[PDB]
Structure 1
Amino acid sequence: RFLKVKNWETDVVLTDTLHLKSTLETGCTEHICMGSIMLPTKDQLFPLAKEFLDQYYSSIKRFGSKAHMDRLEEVNKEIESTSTYQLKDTELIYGAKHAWRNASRCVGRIQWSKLQVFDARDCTTAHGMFNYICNHVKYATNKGNLRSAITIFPQRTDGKHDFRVWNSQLIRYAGYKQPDGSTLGDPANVQFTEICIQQGWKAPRGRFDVLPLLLQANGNDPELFQIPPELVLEVPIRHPKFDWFKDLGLKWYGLPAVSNMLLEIGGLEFSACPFSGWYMGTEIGVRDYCDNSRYNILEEVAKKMDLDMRKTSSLWKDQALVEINIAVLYSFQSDKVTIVDHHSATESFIKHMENEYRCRGGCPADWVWIVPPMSGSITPVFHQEMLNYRLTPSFEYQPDPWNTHVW
């Protein structure tokens, strides 16, 4: 019931009790581990509400005060009456910060408590949503000195009036299937790019076309909006040693901003809650650039490097992978756009786990996601045992809206 995790590099042992609070389920059983699987009413809502308010009031040293009991009373009456309830601002901010704090897949959580929360619960239309989103983009970008932020749209009611951003991230590049048979741009986005075109978007049909936003307010049909280009900070990718690197025509955007997740606070569901921080270098250079199903650029880069591509054992892929990642970091740094390398990010996360173990009794962490997709064992997280479990408030996956929406 008290659980130990060990770091095998430093022998530091932490004891986890926080897991006992865990409410939701992992996918695993005693007979099978699902650790590497990507995705494993009035009566329901009041316990969820209570458990939330309990931790909130405990967090401000007012557990079992009249302020606590009164709020529990007030939310209880409101659920009884309206079948839902409204969060105070203070609760909303707390709930959102803790959803990040509880995100077991997130290596960047040392920053969890510095999150700007934009309350957009008063929003009613897609134009409104566009406005809120542009303000978020500009605030978070901050001319390259990025700041973490979340914007929170109205909460699900009867589920026929959902707010949704259809984009997977606020800023992403278009993907186009060609006569060729090959793919121009980002193949991850082929489908969404066709939904946009099917909606009216004037596709430039280039390699790096910023997607339009497709915003759904109140369960209505989503509408297209172009983000003002002046608000989309992009970085040309060059190498501090290879002159020819720039000839590849690579660029990426500065602001990673997830928009397809569902934020759950005290039983309430926020289906539109775009959030943003900044990139770890490997996200772009390893995954965006080198995944076979992504821009998949390793062959061209190795070619330009004149490596022996005959045998896998020359480690030409590995050589090219490193150079590509050196260049991503160098470019962002040169242009003063916030980025973190995998060494610094993972070091910070170890320090964050130590803080959490001490202050909170644990830190849910998903090793499969936390370990960077290159140089795993030369980062300290590789050698760190982690316990994974689900705490609320949380960010959750939800199905892509086009499968759901009724046109």
Structure 2
Amino acid sequence: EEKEILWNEAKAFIAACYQELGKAAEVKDRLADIKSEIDLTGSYVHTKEELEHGAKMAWRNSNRCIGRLFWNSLNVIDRRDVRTKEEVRDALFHHIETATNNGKIRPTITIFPPEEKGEKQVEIWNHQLIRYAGYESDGERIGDPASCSLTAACEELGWRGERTDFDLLPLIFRMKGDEQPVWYELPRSLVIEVPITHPDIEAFSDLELKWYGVPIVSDMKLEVGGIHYNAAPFNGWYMGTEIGARNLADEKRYDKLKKVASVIGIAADYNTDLWKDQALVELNKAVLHSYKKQGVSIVDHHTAASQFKRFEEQAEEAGRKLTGDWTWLIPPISPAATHIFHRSYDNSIVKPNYFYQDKPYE
């Protein structure tokens, strides 16, 4: 039964992957040797080539991703050889370093041993390798409320935050066999942060806003040809709106719009003044300015949309069906100013792809 769903997903993936790689004749035999390995072992192992390309296809099939134009240049790191928690830690540390690249961010994925029996070899608890802690107790809100449950979990395991609004969470993951995860504090020299300043408004620094340079999503499962890589953190660079329009602006996140309106010198009294909209623009301007000023890669939502239009064009030209999630592709500011808003997308799920999986904490 499980042996079957593995085989069908394998046939579909190998065919498409070898087609794209210009190795269509190699299919027949590779497909045969896989079928054998399935019968014998209950699973099969990807070559470096299959895995690298699979990860790339997976990004290409991510309906919600506006940044897909660069799918083919993803930097794939094959860490299926790790066996220990020191290795997992060091691989994660290394991911941060090479992906950050002094600010010239390389879109990178580190791939760990896949699920065996549906049994995890490694299980990463972090939502992102770099994120800020969050604390809610007795009317006191500190840091990122989205990180509240993970922070409280780390604090059960012996970690303690300094309770600034920007405490870096430790790396926390669990190895197969161990009932409890381990956690490792992050070396500050590895983590680039960007202070938020405004190009025109000097007072903007009084808000003492900052964000981390590299978003490294680490809780999603990569699925390639019937193989489940539940631990495979990947990154791109940020689109400014992620920081300025959501992380810093959402009421249930940092909720800074009222403070932003104050430093930019406008009233936050009437809906008709559109002070929130104005706050959002200046904050988003601020974010872009600050990242560029420091040498940390970032894209604005207009450029991002232009790139994604090219992705649409490149897709049709290659004879590939395009898939997308309109509700996630439009940017949270001025979406009607992008072509994305004015067309529709098929939201079908094609594999290889990245998927949600259940959290171990909570």
**Partner of residue 190, structure 2:** 231
| Partner deviation per Cα, 1:192-249 (whole Å, 9 max, x = no partner) | 0011111111211110011101012225321101221101000010001111111111
Match of 1:350 in 2: 309
Letter in 2 for 1:301: V
CA shift, 1:306, in A, is 3.2
Report the AA paired with residue 310 of structure 1: D
Q: Is the 8 A contact 1:161 1:219 kept in 2?
A: no
What secondary structure, in the 3-state scheme, does the structure 2 residue paired with 1:360 have? coil
Deviation at 1:300, TM superposition (A): 1.2
Task: Pick from 21, 42, 45 the counterpart of residue 3 of structure 2.
Answer: 42
Query: Are 2:131 and 2:168, in contact at CA under 8 Å, matched by a contact in 1?
Result: yes
Q: Which residue of 2 aligns with 1:143?
A: 102
Pairing partner for 1:88 from 25, 32, 47: 47
- What residue is the counterpart of 1:255 in the other structure? 214
Q: How does 1:206-225 map to 2 (within 5 A)?
A: 206-218=164-176, 220=178, 221-225=180-184
Partner of 1:56: 17
Q: Say if 1:124 and 1:218, in contact at 8 Å, map to a contact too.
A: no
Moved over 3 A (4+): none
User: How big is the shift at 1:162?
Assistant: 3.7
TM-score by length of 1: 0.87
Report Cα offsets for 1:301-357 as digits up to 9, x if no partner.
Answer: 112233232221110111111110000000000001000000100011011101101
Gaps of 5+ in 1: 1-40
Q: How far apart are the structure 1 equivalents of 2:166 and 2:155?
A: 16
Number of corresponding residues? 360
Q: Tell me which residue corresponds to 2:57.
A: 98
- Cα distance in 2 between the residues matched to 1:288 and 1:218: 33
Match of 2:134 in 1: 175
Native 8 Å contact 2:66 2:304 kept in 1: yes
Aligned-residue CA RMSD in angstroms? 1.1
Letter in 2 for 1:357: E
Match of 2:348 in 1: 389
Against the structure 1 CA distance between its residues 59 and 294, is the aligned structure 2 distance closer, same or farther, given a 3 Å change threshold? same
Given residue 105 of structure 1, which amino acid in structure 2 is its aligned partner? R
Q: How much has 1:125 moved relative to structure 2?
A: 1.9
- CA contact under 8 A between 1:255 and 1:278: conserved in structure 2? yes
Preserved CA contact (<8 Å) 1:125 1:218: no
Structure 2 segments unaligned to the other structure (5+ residues) = none
Which one of 298, 305, 315 corresponds to residue 257 of structure 2?
298
Task: Quote the Cα distance in structure 2 between the aligned partners of 1:341 and 1:219.
Answer: 44
The answer to whether structure 1 residue 156 and structure 2 residue 137 are counterparts is: no
* Contact 2:114–2:120 (8 Å) recurs in 1: no
1:375 shift after superposition: 0.7
User: Does 1:367 find its partner at 2:326?
Assistant: yes
Q: Is the 8 A contact 1:126 1:222 kept in 2?
A: no
Match for residue 149 of structure 2? 191
TM-score by length of structure 2 reads: 0.97
Equivalent of residue 120 in structure 1, options 79, 98, 113: 79
- The 3 A distance-change label for structure 1 pair 374 and 219 is farther
